[PDB]
Write a protein that binds this ligand. Structure first.
Ligand SMILES: [Mg+2]
Ligand SMILES: [Mg+2]
Ligand SMILES: [Mg+2]
Ligand SMILES: [Mg+2]
Ligand SMILES: [Mg+2]
Ligand SMILES: [Mg+2]
Ligand SMILES: [Mg+2]
Ligand SMILES: [Mg+2]
Ligand SMILES: [Mg+2]
Ligand SMILES: [Mg+2]
Ligand SMILES: [Mg+2]
Ligand SMILES: [Mg+2]
Ligand SMILES: [Mg+2]
Ligand SMILES: [Mg+2]
Ligand SMILES: [Mg+2]
Ligand SMILES: [Mg+2]
Ligand SMILES: [Mg+2]
Ligand SMILES: [Mg+2]
Ligand SMILES: [Mg+2]
Ligand SMILES: [Mg+2]
Ligand SMILES: [Mg+2]
Ligand SMILES: [Mg+2]
Ligand SMILES: [Mg+2]
Ligand SMILES: [Mg+2]
Ligand SMILES: [Mg+2]
Ligand SMILES: [Mg+2]
Ligand SMILES: [Mg+2]
Ligand SMILES: [Mg+2]
Ligand SMILES: [Mg+2]
Ligand SMILES: [Mg+2]
Ligand SMILES: [Mg+2]
Ligand SMILES: [Mg+2]
Ligand SMILES: [Mg+2]
Ligand SMILES: [Mg+2]
Ligand SMILES: [Mg+2]
Ligand SMILES: [Mg+2]
Ligand SMILES: [Mg+2]
Ligand SMILES: [Mg+2]
Ligand SMILES: [Mg+2]
Ligand SMILES: [Mg+2]
Ligand SMILES: [Mg+2]
Ligand SMILES: [Mg+2]
Ligand SMILES: [Mg+2]
Ligand SMILES: [Mg+2]
Ligand SMILES: [Mg+2]
Ligand SMILES: [Mg+2]
Ligand SMILES: [Mg+2]
Ligand SMILES: [Mg+2]
Ligand SMILES: [Mg+2]
Ligand SMILES: [Mg+2]
Ligand SMILES: [Mg+2]
Ligand SMILES: [Mg+2]
Ligand SMILES: [Mg+2]
Ligand SMILES: [Mg+2]
Ligand SMILES: [Mg+2]
Ligand SMILES: [Mg+2]
Ligand SMILES: [Mg+2]
Ligand SMILES: [Mg+2]
Ligand SMILES: [Mg+2]
Ligand SMILES: [Mg+2]
Ligand SMILES: [Mg+2]
Ligand SMILES: [Mg+2]
Ligand SMILES: [Mg+2]
Ligand SMILES: [Mg+2]
Ligand SMILES: [Mg+2]
Ligand SMILES: [Mg+2]
Ligand SMILES: [Mg+2]
Ligand SMILES: [Mg+2]
Ligand SMILES: [Mg+2]
Ligand SMILES: [Mg+2]
Ligand SMILES: [Mg+2]
Ligand SMILES: [Mg+2]
Ligand SMILES: [Mg+2]
Ligand SMILES: [Mg+2]
Ligand SMILES: [Mg+2]
Ligand SMILES: [Mg+2]
Ligand SMILES: [Mg+2]
Ligand SMILES: [Mg+2]
Ligand SMILES: [Mg+2]
Ligand SMILES: [Mg+2]
Ligand SMILES: [Mg+2]
Ligand SMILES: [Mg+2]
Ligand SMILES: [Mg+2]
Ligand SMILES: [Mg+2]
Ligand SMILES: [Mg+2]
Ligand SMILES: [Mg+2]
Ligand SMILES: [Mg+2]
Ligand SMILES: [Mg+2]
Ligand SMILES: [Mg+2]
Ligand SMILES: [Mg+2]
Ligand SMILES: [Mg+2]
Ligand SMILES: [Mg+2]
Ligand SMILES: [Mg+2]
Ligand SMILES: [Mg+2]
Ligand SMILES: [Mg+2]
Ligand SMILES: [Mg+2]
Ligand SMILES: [Mg+2]
Ligand SMILES: [Mg+2]
Ligand SMILES: [Mg+2]
Ligand SMILES: [Mg+2]
Ligand SMILES: [Mg+2]
Ligand SMILES: [Mg+2]
Ligand SMILES: [Mg+2]
Ligand SMILES: [Mg+2]
Ligand SMILES: [Mg+2]
Ligand SMILES: [Mg+2]
Ligand SMILES: [Mg+2]
Ligand SMILES: [Mg+2]
Ligand SMILES: [Mg+2]
Ligand SMILES: [Mg+2]
Ligand SMILES: [Mg+2]
Ligand SMILES: [Mg+2]
Ligand SMILES: [Mg+2]
Ligand SMILES: [Mg+2]
Ligand SMILES: [Mg+2]
Ligand SMILES: [Mg+2]
Ligand SMILES: [Mg+2]
Ligand SMILES: [Mg+2]
Ligand SMILES: [Mg+2]
Ligand SMILES: [Mg+2]
Ligand SMILES: [Mg+2]
Ligand SMILES: [Mg+2]
Ligand SMILES: [Mg+2]
Ligand SMILES: [Mg+2]
Ligand SMILES: [Mg+2]
Ligand SMILES: [Mg+2]
Ligand SMILES: [Mg+2]
Ligand SMILES: [Mg+2]
Ligand SMILES: [Mg+2]
Ligand SMILES: [Mg+2]
Ligand SMILES: [Mg+2]
Ligand SMILES: [Mg+2]
Ligand SMILES: [Mg+2]
Ligand SMILES: [Mg+2]
Ligand SMILES: [Mg+2]
Ligand SMILES: [Mg+2]
Ligand SMILES: [Mg+2]
Ligand SMILES: [Mg+2]
Ligand SMILES: [Mg+2]
Ligand SMILES: [Mg+2]
Ligand SMILES: [Mg+2]
Ligand SMILES: [Mg+2]
Ligand SMILES: [Mg+2]
Ligand SMILES: [Mg+2]
Ligand SMILES: [Mg+2]
Ligand SMILES: [Mg+2]
Ligand SMILES: [Mg+2]
Ligand SMILES: [Mg+2]
Ligand SMILES: [Mg+2]
Ligand SMILES: [Mg+2]
Ligand SMILES: [Mg+2]
Ligand SMILES: [Mg+2]
Ligand SMILES: [Mg+2]
Ligand SMILES: [Mg+2]
Ligand SMILES: [Mg+2]
Ligand SMILES: [Mg+2]
Ligand SMILES: [Mg+2]
Ligand SMILES: [Mg+2]
Ligand SMILES: [Mg+2]
Ligand SMILES: [Mg+2]
Ligand SMILES: [Mg+2]
Ligand SMILES: [Mg+2]
Ligand SMILES: [Mg+2]
Ligand SMILES: [Mg+2]
Ligand SMILES: [Mg+2]
Ligand SMILES: [Mg+2]
Ligand SMILES: [Mg+2]
Ligand SMILES: [Mg+2]
Ligand SMILES: [Mg+2]
Ligand SMILES: [Mg+2]
Ligand SMILES: [Mg+2]
Ligand SMILES: [Mg+2]
Ligand SMILES: [Mg+2]
Ligand SMILES: [Mg+2]
Ligand SMILES: [Mg+2]
Ligand SMILES: [Mg+2]
Ligand SMILES: [Mg+2]
Ligand SMILES: [Mg+2]
Ligand SMILES: [Mg+2]
Ligand SMILES: [Mg+2]
Ligand SMILES: [Mg+2]
Ligand SMILES: [Mg+2]
Ligand SMILES: [Mg+2]
Ligand SMILES: [Mg+2]
Ligand SMILES: [Mg+2]
Ligand SMILES: [Mg+2]
Ligand SMILES: [Mg+2]
Ligand SMILES: [Mg+2]
Ligand SMILES: [Mg+2]
Ligand SMILES: [Mg+2]
Ligand SMILES: [Mg+2]
Ligand SMILES: [Mg+2]
Ligand SMILES: [Mg+2]
Ligand SMILES: [Mg+2]
Ligand SMILES: [Mg+2]
Ligand SMILES: [Mg+2]
Ligand SMILES: [Mg+2]
Ligand SMILES: [Mg+2]
Ligand SMILES: [Mg+2]
Ligand SMILES: [Mg+2]
Ligand SMILES: [Mg+2]
Ligand SMILES: [Mg+2]
Ligand SMILES: [Mg+2]
Ligand SMILES: [Mg+2]
Ligand SMILES: [Mg+2]
Ligand SMILES: [Mg+2]
Ligand SMILES: [Mg+2]
Ligand SMILES: [Mg+2]
Ligand SMILES: [Mg+2]
Ligand SMILES: [Mg+2]
Ligand SMILES: [Mg+2]
Ligand SMILES: [Mg+2]
Ligand SMILES: [Mg+2]
Ligand SMILES: [Mg+2]
Ligand SMILES: [Mg+2]
Ligand SMILES: [Mg+2]
Ligand SMILES: [Mg+2]
Ligand SMILES: [Mg+2]
Ligand SMILES: [Mg+2]
Ligand SMILES: [Mg+2]
Ligand SMILES: [Mg+2]
Ligand SMILES: [Mg+2]
Ligand SMILES: [Mg+2]
Ligand SMILES: [Mg+2]
Ligand SMILES: [Mg+2]
Ligand SMILES: [Mg+2]
Ligand SMILES: [Mg+2]
Ligand SMILES: [Mg+2]
Ligand SMILES: [Mg+2]
Ligand SMILES: [Mg+2]
Ligand SMILES: [Mg+2]
Lengths: 275, 48
RNA sequence: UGGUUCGUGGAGCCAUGGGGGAAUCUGGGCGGACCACCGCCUAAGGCUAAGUACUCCGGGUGACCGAUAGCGCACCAGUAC
RNA sequence: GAGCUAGCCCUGGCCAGGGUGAAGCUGGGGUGAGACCCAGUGGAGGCCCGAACCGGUGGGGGAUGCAAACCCCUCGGAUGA
RNA sequence: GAAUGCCGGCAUGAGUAACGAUAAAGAGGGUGAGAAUCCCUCUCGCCGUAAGCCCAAGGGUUCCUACGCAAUGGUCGUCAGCGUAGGGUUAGGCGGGACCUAAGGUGAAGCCGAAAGGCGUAGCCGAAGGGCAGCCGGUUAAUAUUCCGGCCCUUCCCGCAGGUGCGAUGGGGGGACGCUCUAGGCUAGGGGGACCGGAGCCAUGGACGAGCCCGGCCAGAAGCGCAGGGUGGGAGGUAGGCAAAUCCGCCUCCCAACAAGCUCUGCGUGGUGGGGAAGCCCGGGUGACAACCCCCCGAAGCCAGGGAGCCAAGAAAAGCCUCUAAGCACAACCUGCGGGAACCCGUACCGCAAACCGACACAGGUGGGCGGGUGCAAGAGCACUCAGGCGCGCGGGAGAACCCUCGCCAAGGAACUCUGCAAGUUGGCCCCGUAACUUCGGGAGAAGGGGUGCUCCCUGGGGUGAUGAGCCCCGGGGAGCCGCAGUGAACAGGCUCUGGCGACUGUUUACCAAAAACACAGCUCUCUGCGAACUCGUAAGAGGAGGUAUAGGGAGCGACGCUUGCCCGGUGCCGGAAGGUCAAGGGGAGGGGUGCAAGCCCCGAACCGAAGCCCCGGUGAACGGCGGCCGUAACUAUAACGGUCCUAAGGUAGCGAAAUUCCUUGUCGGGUAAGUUCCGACCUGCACGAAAAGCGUAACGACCGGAGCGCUGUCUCGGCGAGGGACCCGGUGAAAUUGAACUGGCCGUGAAGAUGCGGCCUACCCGUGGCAGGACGAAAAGACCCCGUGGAGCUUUACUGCAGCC
RNA sequence: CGAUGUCGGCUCGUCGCAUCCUGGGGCUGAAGAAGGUCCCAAGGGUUGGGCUGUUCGCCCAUUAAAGCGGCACGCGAGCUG
RNA sequence: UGGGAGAGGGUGGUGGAAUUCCCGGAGUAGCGGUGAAAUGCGCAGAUACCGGGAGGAACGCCGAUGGCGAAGGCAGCCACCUGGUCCACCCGUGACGCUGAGGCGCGAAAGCGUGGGGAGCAAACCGGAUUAGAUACCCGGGUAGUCCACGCCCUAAACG
RNA sequence: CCGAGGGUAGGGCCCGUGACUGGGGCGAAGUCGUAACAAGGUAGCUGUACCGGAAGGUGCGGCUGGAU
């Protein structure tokens, strides 16, 4: 579900929020939060290196467990499902029988009180971590490591998932959310299921103010600038691009492939993204 | 209306201060010149 | 590539960022591409006074100034501002 | 040189009073259950009126000014980008 | 002798403008050489969510006192934020430091850079954040939470007693948190009292009264009382909290549980210590043995780390508690008590301003707290007023033009004008009542209209009391009174119809543009598989992001509704492992120099040899483009149709004299007495057209057009009045400008627009208030224009490079 | 060109006469009345609105008439903009 | 009460054939298509054959003049949840019935909104032919859509 | 007090009319093509969708009122 508002204001008319019904606890585990140093887009030089950012709501980085093989064979009870402002996805608070508490990206279909486990011997059930070589081919999977013991990298965003399409030696064949077919190492941990909160993409911000809340400052069209600023600058009255459409830095923004060609990871990428 | 001079003793000291000067090759050389000129105060007097 | 008067010129010489890579005098470098001849010199370790440059300071002397001049300042001036 | 100005970061502070009355909740009506309707509750919003505060719409004054951008009247935002 | 030369002096304008908010002054008395300007009294006015009071910045002796007036003060000056001198700032509790961390800064380890240097988890630095022990009164010319007085309290050291496994920079807990709304109970603050205290007053016609006027508190340990906050207890297991652990976390049982308990804070009382008015008398005396109480109102402040809801999900670290570790246990820590110890810096005064930022004692700017009373629905709004502070550092007169600000106006009511610019109108609150359209929220305060004071009579509900009186709150119904007028003064929408543009709230050219521009949710292309792309940097390193394709970058479009056609020849991008061309390099037929020679040196063909371009193809929400002539239908006209040339293909839907229409005020219709505007149509659209989007769209707009109603000094058409100037007198006293001047009209002449030449005409000498035709008036070495082998910003299929990428 | 501010409006005029009106006439295809045309004449007069920035013009309602020009396309140290 | 048949419906699963696409191997001068052709595809190695992978849709034989539903409609297979209906017993209830203006629900395809999915097919569209022209018929391409979930839309030769 | 009515303001229905615009009926002696009736020379009709000078065409599903 995605909550809709009656139009008692101009922007309430299209504004929609999440349903938040999957959420059980409304406070973060103090043991597991750390302050998030906001960057405002600027680097260590003080210079903006990513534009139109800052002024977002104050947020508190919940530490997430992307290793999960950190505790093999040791089970855990899904204690609560919480809101994480630091990501599209929802997080689950795991009470390990070890006593240790941890956060994991909450898969779709998790249950408050259900128990999960990481390990090769682990069952093929929701929210269970295994190396890929022990996961059945065809089974949907999320939060995939890219290399062994380097932490989950792929399929972490809300609703996203990857599907195993077969094996080949030390490596297996994954269909990443993009649709790219890639060889991931068979010894890479992954968590069966798909990321929850799949309704995320169907959220209408509704107003200019909501974008600001998310730390997103207003964007400015190249066309709305002058020649010193943008390639699309100047022009008396409005104007077409008058050149191939380009970035502020001159490089072409329509169709031009920018991935490095001789990148060694090409050997493990089968099919480039589609659509 | 609000003008360009809005005195602040911390800001004055942490900017044109002697310790600010000596920290930077440009600033150290400023002191050299001011000293060479015979200037009575190499760094802006400020009341701490 | 730089240096030399040498701006690729017939372009050697001195220096060297890259690649290849010796020999110990029957060794090697040089005399303006190169080859012979005839000569000159002994690279890949270091040090070395004096003759030379400058004038904060001290002194001597001006066909130099004489308070709008001579130093920005003859005076409590790199000050007042 | 960011003590003006622009943006961002950290940490604080400020916004009288009044108006409108979303979701929800409860009670009732309705149905196989519902949807839904109704009243009461409720107190949402880049919501309304309007001071502080932030502005600078129109007019007049000022024009060796009170002022190297001011003054009078009027007007905009005023829980939010 | 000239350089709008440089430096200085002194002129002109000129006794001219001005003398800095129109809040406002008058008199009496003193001082003194001198008084509108200093002191004192009285009268008058002004602020009173300040123009009062208290903080923090900043300023740095401006503070107090004495003695002074050359200068500073826009006048004066006896006065002063001025000159001379002397004095004045007192803290274990206030602030900061000997505490803590935030961004950031710095930076052992480490990484990088020609040098200078750039980075960098820890550590350290860094505060208006966390932490932390003082309240009330008295006193000085000037300081006080600092001195004094009373009542409290913190830490450190030592000792005593009792207690305990003590012990940490290590572990855990806690500190520890948003926005909005909000409960209960208090306090601050306030109003009333026929009660208490008080010097008094009885005027001018009445009043000796439940009369008037004044005051009726403050702080305070323990204990207690009320209100709240915080917190489960015991046992067993334990593999996690990078050692250890009895702590914490997790599992299980037993009780307890919206309580109680233990603990913390607030408020009340509280032994005691203080304060204590009007009036009167010369800051103090008195009042006064002052009184010191009851009712009501009541916070945004306190209990607080309270509650609820919501999404945008809301610092850290120390203090603190607990766990253990080395160690150590005749030590240590804990608890109570006692004695001793407790350092550095700040403290004056201004502080919405004459002491700060604005060259000025400058109508500007400057963060936090307090900010009383009454009336107006409310409130920090508005009017008056308390406390407190002021009358703004030139005055006195006169009562011209003219200017500013303001008041009113016969008849008319937009005839004004680019435009109702401006000014009227309207105006708060209660009731009645409200259209097209709509996205069903709205439009809507639509429109329009009725009510509004006071007096007496009756009655209803609430809060605090007690369920009653009293108080306070919210009403209802009658019958009456006065005026031109009852939100009787102040504060407080004019309205409606209709088009363009933009959906909207927002943003912008600080100092001539606030818009239709920017932004905006939303749409679509496109890049990016993570050591991401991209951005910054020589690099290291960063940002992206402690994110992972429901993500991140770039571009365009810009809610929403209905849609977005045709052209891939050229350009760009994507795909193409053939082919063609192509540099270094590989190759070495062959040719050359030189030598007696072996040899050295050199040129050098075929052949192999990347990207790139050529080439083949794909691609429009990539750059872009989207024709012409001729013929033809029972009258004419027109052309469904046909013919042909060209093209990469010839504009689809919808819209159209438009933010676009040259001809043009196109034509027709509407509105008007009259309409180059406006609205509705028509289409031979000079020169619309579909994401530089096409066409519409409710709501929205200090946007730009058109119309009407309402009302008006905008106007016919001006009049009068007020105040501040202007004028006159006393005081002070500028400025640009200035070749020198003894500076008239006409008609001519002159470098072609003459005070200055000619001829005439006119004209006694010098001022003052006024008007602006001329001195090609002043100002600025023309912004336009051109010129210079002048300069910059910007563009590109100009040239030539470089970064970057291949 | 070390600056001679520009359309139109407003205000204020003043002048030329190639006269729009009023006054005096000649001719007339002048019966009258009303005109046509030329002559003399500058004394005075020459309205109010709609549209457009407009001058200009068109139009409305009048009028004796609704003249045309010069004065830096008169007049911005007089205003408007 | 005791039975029975059946593509009635809903959900979750799963099985094979074929097409297309991608990789590999082998092979070469054409494949394709039509009334005949051409566009298109093919020495940049197609078609025809073999192995492998991805993916979507529809379920051959059974299959029938059949079955079921009120209609629309419903077909590989398994399970679950679920409706209608027929038979025997003649056991209970004792007219409780038929019909049905309004109302409500369902309702093929095409179409719409949001999101997925896209192999084949295929409005629009492009091209090749035919033609007098061919905005068609035929041919090579090809976008919505065809498929799933959710909400609309409520039409039909919705016919017996 | 009520009150004919008058007045201001705002709604509702009906009628006439209006630049222009849409399609309809009739006219026929016009131009363009030939869609339907035979298998009408691509079987037809139909709901819907898109498209074209026009009749119509094509897609998706449906009916036989389809020749053989
Ligand atoms: Mg709502
Ligand atoms: Mg609304
Ligand atoms: Mg929600
Ligand atoms: Mg929270
Ligand atoms: Mg926290
Ligand atoms: Mg913490
Ligand atoms: Mg840093
Ligand atoms: Mg820095
Ligand atoms: Mg959910
Ligand atoms: Mg989205
Ligand atoms: Mg969307
Ligand atoms: Mg964005
Ligand atoms: Mg933008
Ligand atoms: Mg621009
Ligand atoms: Mg720039
Ligand atoms: Mg550029
Ligand atoms: Mg451009
Ligand atoms: Mg520009
Ligand atoms: Mg432009
Ligand atoms: Mg243009
Ligand atoms: Mg890899
Ligand atoms: Mg300000
Ligand atoms: Mg200055
Ligand atoms: Mg400071
Ligand atoms: Mg400070
Ligand atoms: Mg000195
Ligand atoms: Mg050289
Ligand atoms: Mg040469
Ligand atoms: Mg050379
Ligand atoms: Mg070398
Ligand atoms: Mg030798
Ligand atoms: Mg050598
Ligand atoms: Mg040599
Ligand atoms: Mg030689
Ligand atoms: Mg040697
Ligand atoms: Mg030496
Ligand atoms: Mg010697
Ligand atoms: Mg020497
Ligand atoms: Mg000397
Ligand atoms: Mg001398
Ligand atoms: Mg001198
Ligand atoms: Mg000198
Ligand atoms: Mg001298
Ligand atoms: Mg000098
Ligand atoms: Mg700043
Ligand atoms: Mg305040
Ligand atoms: Mg409020
Ligand atoms: Mg609720
Ligand atoms: Mg509200
Ligand atoms: Mg608002
Ligand atoms: Mg407002
Ligand atoms: Mg203004
Ligand atoms: Mg402005
Ligand atoms: Mg005025
Ligand atoms: Mg000015
Ligand atoms: Mg305002
Ligand atoms: Mg606003
Ligand atoms: Mg905010
Ligand atoms: Mg000078
Ligand atoms: Mg005078
Ligand atoms: Mg004068
Ligand atoms: Mg004068
Ligand atoms: Mg004067
Ligand atoms: Mg003045
Ligand atoms: Mg005034
Ligand atoms: Mg005055
Ligand atoms: Mg007054
Ligand atoms: Mg006297
Ligand atoms: Mg007050
Ligand atoms: Mg003093
Ligand atoms: Mg003093
Ligand atoms: Mg003096
Ligand atoms: Mg004197
Ligand atoms: Mg003196
Ligand atoms: Mg004086
Ligand atoms: Mg002064
Ligand atoms: Mg003094
Ligand atoms: Mg003390
Ligand atoms: Mg302290
Ligand atoms: Mg110490
Ligand atoms: Mg410290
Ligand atoms: Mg550093
Ligand atoms: Mg180091
Ligand atoms: Mg601090
Ligand atoms: Mg303290
Ligand atoms: Mg005191
Ligand atoms: Mg003192
Ligand atoms: Mg103990
Ligand atoms: Mg212990
Ligand atoms: Mg500890
Ligand atoms: Mg309360
Ligand atoms: Mg108290
Ligand atoms: Mg009497
Ligand atoms: Mg009190
Ligand atoms: Mg266990
Ligand atoms: Mg352990
Ligand atoms: Mg234990
Ligand atoms: Mg007390
Ligand atoms: Mg007393
Ligand atoms: Mg006494
Ligand atoms: Mg007595
Ligand atoms: Mg007594
Ligand atoms: Mg109370
Ligand atoms: Mg409040
Ligand atoms: Mg709370
Ligand atoms: Mg620390
Ligand atoms: Mg031990
Ligand atoms: Mg010390
Ligand atoms: Mg003090
Ligand atoms: Mg003070
Ligand atoms: Mg102020
Ligand atoms: Mg203040
Ligand atoms: Mg003050
Ligand atoms: Mg003062
Ligand atoms: Mg000042
Ligand atoms: Mg000063
Ligand atoms: Mg003053
Ligand atoms: Mg001031
Ligand atoms: Mg202020
Ligand atoms: Mg009020
Ligand atoms: Mg106000
Ligand atoms: Mg006020
Ligand atoms: Mg007052
Ligand atoms: Mg004054
Ligand atoms: Mg009047
Ligand atoms: Mg009227
Ligand atoms: Mg007019
Ligand atoms: Mg106005
Ligand atoms: Mg009013
Ligand atoms: Mg209407
Ligand atoms: Mg009204
Ligand atoms: Mg009265
Ligand atoms: Mg109002
Ligand atoms: Mg228009
Ligand atoms: Mg706008
Ligand atoms: Mg706005
Ligand atoms: Mg501006
Ligand atoms: Mg500017
Ligand atoms: Mg601004
Ligand atoms: Mg400026
Ligand atoms: Mg400016
Ligand atoms: Mg505006
Ligand atoms: Mg859109
Ligand atoms: Mg990084
Ligand atoms: Mg990073
Ligand atoms: Mg990160
Ligand atoms: Mg745009
Ligand atoms: Mg093309
Ligand atoms: Mg192309
Ligand atoms: Mg092409
Ligand atoms: Mg093509
Ligand atoms: Mg390419
Ligand atoms: Mg080949
Ligand atoms: Mg040879
Ligand atoms: Mg030879
Ligand atoms: Mg190549
Ligand atoms: Mg297009
Ligand atoms: Mg082109
Ligand atoms: Mg004809
Ligand atoms: Mg068309
Ligand atoms: Mg028109
Ligand atoms: Mg046009
Ligand atoms: Mg033109
Ligand atoms: Mg036109
Ligand atoms: Mg005309
Ligand atoms: Mg008409
Ligand atoms: Mg106009
Ligand atoms: Mg029109
Ligand atoms: Mg036409
Ligand atoms: Mg356009
Ligand atoms: Mg376009
Ligand atoms: Mg439009
Ligand atoms: Mg609509
Ligand atoms: Mg509109
Ligand atoms: Mg506006
Ligand atoms: Mg007037
Ligand atoms: Mg007057
Ligand atoms: Mg006078
Ligand atoms: Mg002449
Ligand atoms: Mg002339
Ligand atoms: Mg002349
Ligand atoms: Mg003369
Ligand atoms: Mg003049
Ligand atoms: Mg004048
Ligand atoms: Mg003259
Ligand atoms: Mg002039
Ligand atoms: Mg001039
Ligand atoms: Mg000037
Ligand atoms: Mg010059
Ligand atoms: Mg010039
Ligand atoms: Mg300019
Ligand atoms: Mg040239
Ligand atoms: Mg030249
Ligand atoms: Mg040049
Ligand atoms: Mg240039
Ligand atoms: Mg770079
Ligand atoms: Mg690139
Ligand atoms: Mg000129
Ligand atoms: Mg004449
Ligand atoms: Mg005759
Ligand atoms: Mg006659
Ligand atoms: Mg006659
Ligand atoms: Mg005559
Ligand atoms: Mg005349
Ligand atoms: Mg005359
Ligand atoms: Mg005349
Ligand atoms: Mg007009
Ligand atoms: Mg006449
Ligand atoms: Mg004339
Ligand atoms: Mg002219
Ligand atoms: Mg003129
Ligand atoms: Mg004229
Ligand atoms: Mg002017
Ligand atoms: Mg003018
Ligand atoms: Mg203007
Ligand atoms: Mg203009
Ligand atoms: Mg069959
Ligand atoms: Mg049947
Ligand atoms: Mg029976
Ligand atoms: Mg029976
Ligand atoms: Mg249907
Ligand atoms: Mg369908
Ligand atoms: Mg075709
Ligand atoms: Mg044709
Ligand atoms: Mg096909
Ligand atoms: Mg049938
Ligand atoms: Mg036919
Ligand atoms: Mg047919
Ligand atoms: Mg047929
Ligand atoms: Mg045609
Ligand atoms: Mg077709």
């Amino acid at each position: 579900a995605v909550k809709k508002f009656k139009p008692y204001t101009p922007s309430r008319r299209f504004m929609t929020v999440a349903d938040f019904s999957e959420i059980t606890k409304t406070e973060p585990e103090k043991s597991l939060v750390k302050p998030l140093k906001k960057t405002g887009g600027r680097n260590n030089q003080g210079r903006i290196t990513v534009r139109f950012r800052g002024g977002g709501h104050k947020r508190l980085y919940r530490i997430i467990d992307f290793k999960r093989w950190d505790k093999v064979g040791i089970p855990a009870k899904v204690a609560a499902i919480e809101y994480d402002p630091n990501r599209s996805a929802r997080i689950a608070l795991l009470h390990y029988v070890d006593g240790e508490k941890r956060y994991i990206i909450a898969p779709d279909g998790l249950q408050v009180g259900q128990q999960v486990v990481a390990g090769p011997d682990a069952p093929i059930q929701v929210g269970n971590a295994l190396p890929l070589r022990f996961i059945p081919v065809g089974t949907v999977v999320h939060a995939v490591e890219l290399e062994p013991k380097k932490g989950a990298k792929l399929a972490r965003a809300a609703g996203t998932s990857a599907q195993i399409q077969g094996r080949e030696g030390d490596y297996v064949i994954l269909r990443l959310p993009s649709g790219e077919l890639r060889k991931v190492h068979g010894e890479c941990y992954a968590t069966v299921g798909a990321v929850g909160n799949a309704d995320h993409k169907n959220i209408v911000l509704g107003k200019a103010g909501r974008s600001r809340w998310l730390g997103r400052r207003p964007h400015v069209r190249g066309a709305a600038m002058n020649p010193v600023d943008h390639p699309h600058g100047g022009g008396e009255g409005r104007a077409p691009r008058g050149r191939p459409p380009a970035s502020p830095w001159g490089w072409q923004t329509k169709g031009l492939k920018t991935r490095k060609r001789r990148k060694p990871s090409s050997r493990f990428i089968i099919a480039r993204r589609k659509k | 209306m609000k003008r360009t001079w809005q005195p602040n003793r911390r800001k004055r000291a942490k900017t044109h201060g002697f310790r600010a000067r000596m920290r930077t090759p440009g600033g150290r050389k400023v002191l050299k010149r001011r000293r060479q000129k015979g200037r009575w105060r190499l760094t802006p007097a400020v009341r701490k």
